[PDB]
Design an enzyme around this catalytic site. Structure first.
Site, PDB file in Angstrom:
ATOM      1  N   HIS A  62       0.828  -1.226   0.000  1.00 17.09           N
ATOM      2  CA  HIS A  62       0.000   0.000   0.000  1.00 17.09           C
ATOM      3  C   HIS A  62       0.860   1.273   0.000  1.00 17.09           C
ATOM      4  O   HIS A  62       0.552   2.288  -0.665  1.00 17.09           O
ATOM      5  CB  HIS A  62      -0.955   0.014   1.217  1.00 17.09           C
ATOM      6  CG  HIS A  62      -1.828  -1.205   1.319  1.00 17.09           C
ATOM      7  ND1 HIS A  62      -2.810  -1.489   0.390  1.00 17.09           N
ATOM      8  CD2 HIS A  62      -1.887  -2.177   2.252  1.00 17.09           C
ATOM      9  CE1 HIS A  62      -3.420  -2.612   0.730  1.00 17.09           C
ATOM     10  NE2 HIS A  62      -2.892  -3.043   1.866  1.00 17.09           N
ATOM     11  N   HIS A  92       5.038   6.771   7.262  1.00 14.48           N
ATOM     12  CA  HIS A  92       4.816   6.439   5.873  1.00 14.48           C
ATOM     13  C   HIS A  92       4.267   7.668   5.173  1.00 14.48           C
ATOM     14  O   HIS A  92       3.985   8.687   5.793  1.00 14.48           O
ATOM     15  CB  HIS A  92       3.778   5.281   5.756  1.00 14.48           C
ATOM     16  CG  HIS A  92       2.475   5.620   6.352  1.00 14.48           C
ATOM     17  ND1 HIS A  92       2.155   5.504   7.675  1.00 14.48           N
ATOM     18  CD2 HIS A  92       1.429   6.237   5.757  1.00 14.48           C
ATOM     19  CE1 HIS A  92       0.930   6.032   7.879  1.00 14.48           C
ATOM     20  NE2 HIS A  92       0.460   6.521   6.726  1.00 14.48           N
ATOM     21  N   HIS A  94       1.626   9.158   1.735  1.00 12.36           N
ATOM     22  CA  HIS A  94       0.581   8.985   0.669  1.00 12.36           C
ATOM     23  C   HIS A  94       0.968   9.964  -0.419  1.00 12.36           C
ATOM     24  O   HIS A  94       1.379  11.101  -0.105  1.00 12.36           O
ATOM     25  CB  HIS A  94      -0.816   9.368   1.234  1.00 12.36           C
ATOM     26  CG  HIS A  94      -1.166   8.580   2.453  1.00 12.36           C
ATOM     27  ND1 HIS A  94      -1.968   7.442   2.421  1.00 12.36           N
ATOM     28  CD2 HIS A  94      -0.817   8.721   3.789  1.00 12.36           C
ATOM     29  CE1 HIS A  94      -2.087   6.932   3.649  1.00 12.36           C
ATOM     30  NE2 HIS A  94      -1.365   7.675   4.507  1.00 12.36           N
ATOM     31  N   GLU A 104      -3.861  13.489   1.693  1.00 10.85           N
ATOM     32  CA  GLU A 104      -5.160  12.990   2.227  1.00 10.85           C
ATOM     33  C   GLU A 104      -5.935  14.177   2.791  1.00 10.85           C
ATOM     34  O   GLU A 104      -7.050  14.489   2.366  1.00 10.85           O
ATOM     35  CB  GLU A 104      -4.885  11.892   3.270  1.00 10.85           C
ATOM     36  CG  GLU A 104      -4.207  10.659   2.589  1.00 10.85           C
ATOM     37  CD  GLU A 104      -4.498   9.433   3.319  1.00 10.85           C
ATOM     38  OE1 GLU A 104      -4.246   9.390   4.564  1.00 10.85           O
ATOM     39  OE2 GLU A 104      -4.985   8.468   2.705  1.00 10.85           O
ATOM     40  N   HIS A 117       2.893  10.839   7.328  1.00 11.62           N
ATOM     41  CA  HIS A 117       2.238  10.512   8.595  1.00 11.62           C
ATOM     42  C   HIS A 117       3.255   9.825   9.505  1.00 11.62           C
ATOM     43  O   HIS A 117       3.756   8.754   9.205  1.00 11.62           O
ATOM     44  CB  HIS A 117       1.109   9.553   8.313  1.00 11.62           C
ATOM     45  CG  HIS A 117      -0.065  10.219   7.631  1.00 11.62           C
ATOM     46  ND1 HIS A 117      -1.060   9.516   6.999  1.00 11.62           N
ATOM     47  CD2 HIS A 117      -0.362  11.517   7.500  1.00 11.62           C
ATOM     48  CE1 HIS A 117      -1.899  10.375   6.479  1.00 11.62           C
ATOM     49  NE2 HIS A 117      -1.526  11.595   6.775  1.00 11.62           N
ATOM     50  N   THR A 196      -6.750   6.292   8.212  1.00  9.13           N
ATOM     51  CA  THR A 196      -7.190   6.552   6.830  1.00  9.13           C
ATOM     52  C   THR A 196      -7.112   5.359   5.920  1.00  9.13           C
ATOM     53  O   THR A 196      -7.468   5.471   4.759  1.00  9.13           O
ATOM     54  CB  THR A 196      -6.479   7.717   6.184  1.00  9.13           C
ATOM     55  OG1 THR A 196      -5.135   7.307   5.914  1.00  9.13           O
ATOM     56  CG2 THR A 196      -6.444   8.917   7.044  1.00  9.13           C
TER      57      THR A 196
END
Ligand SMILES: [N]S(=O)(=O)[C][C][C]C1234B567B89%10B%11%12%13B85%14B%1158B%12%11%15B%139%12B%1061B%12%112C5%153B%14874
Ligand SMILES: [Zn+2]
Length: 258
Positions: A62, A92, A94, A104, A117, A196
């Site tokens: 992911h 990590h 996004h 996000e 995050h 999330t």
């Protein structure tokens, strides 16, 4: 047929396996800057990462996770809106397929290229798995990324990504200092929310920093060479691994700054 980010398994599908997806304190959210209220009772954030001990980097299918030794009180977050002590377990990102999306949280509907995050758990619950069962179990520090100048403190992360291209690969990743990923200012917004990603648990106090960090186009291009698939499977580039903004419902976003 597991969850992911594609149109048959992505965020609009997650509620079928995780009905809390339609809950009352879901994340992320749009931060409407004119509506967030300055709260003079909010404390400065205390980010103590001088003794952080990274161990490993993992492609989980992911995103990639930079993991820390959380067996002692070393890297901790306190103050701000928090009561007590939160221990750093991992960070990590996004990110998007192009620089105009990837974050996000949004700020007055603006999407940043990526969002970092830093995940911490409340030591009063003893372990992470117990913490995620509590409404005040986690604190996630969120930092926006914009594309401009390189972030020198990110480059060690970028350079290891070739060795964890595919789902399930990991690599030793010791002595990485997450202080090098922080902006100058610790001004923030805060609100109660959730994870999330599945399982979407409503256990998070979100702390989102106002000041983005700048990363180079080359740095983010290397994020986008990762793969969601495992080794020896057809290539699916790891991009657009973000959940869209969710309804704010009965919540207030508070600002630490005027
Ligand atoms: N975007 S976030 O809310 O910080 C959730 C990140 C994904 C996960 B991975 B597994 B455990 B490991 B920890 B909790 B579970 B997944 B949720 C956070 B990390
Ligand atoms: Zn995240």
């Amino acid at each position: 047929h597991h969850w992911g980010y594609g149109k048959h398994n992505g965020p609009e599908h997650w509620h079928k396996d995780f009905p809390i997806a339609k809950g009352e304190r879901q994340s992320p959210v749009d931060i409407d800057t004119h509506t967030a209220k300055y709260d003079p009772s909010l404390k400065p954030l205390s980010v103590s990462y001088d003794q952080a001990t990274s161990l490993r980097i993992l492609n989980n299918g992911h995103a990639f996770n930079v993991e820390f030794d959380d067996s002692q009180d070393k890297a901790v977050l306190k103050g701000g809106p928090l009561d007590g002590t939160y221990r750093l377990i991992q960070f990590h990102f996004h990110w998007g397929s192009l620089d105009g999306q990837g974050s996000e949280h949004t700020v007055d509907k603006k999407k940043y290229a990526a969002e970092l995050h830093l995940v911490h758990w409340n030591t009063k619950y003893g372990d992470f798995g117990k913490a995620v069962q509590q409404p005040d179990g986690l604190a996630v520090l969120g930092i926006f990324l914009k594309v401009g100048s390189a972030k020198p403190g990110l480059q060690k992360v970028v350079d290891v990504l070739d060795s964890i291209k595919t789902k399930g690969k990991s690599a030793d990743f010791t002595n990485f200092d997450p202080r090098g990923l922080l902006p100058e200012s610790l001004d923030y917004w805060t609100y109660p929310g959730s994870l999330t990603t599945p399982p979407l648990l409503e256990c998070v106090t979100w702390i989102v920093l106002k000041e983005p960090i700048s990363v180079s186009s080359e740095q983010v291009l290397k994020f986008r060479k990762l793969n969601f698939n495992g080794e020896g499977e057809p290539e699916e580039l790891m991009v657009d691994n973000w959940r869209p903004a969710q309804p704010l419902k009965n919540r207030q976003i508070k600002a630490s700054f005027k």
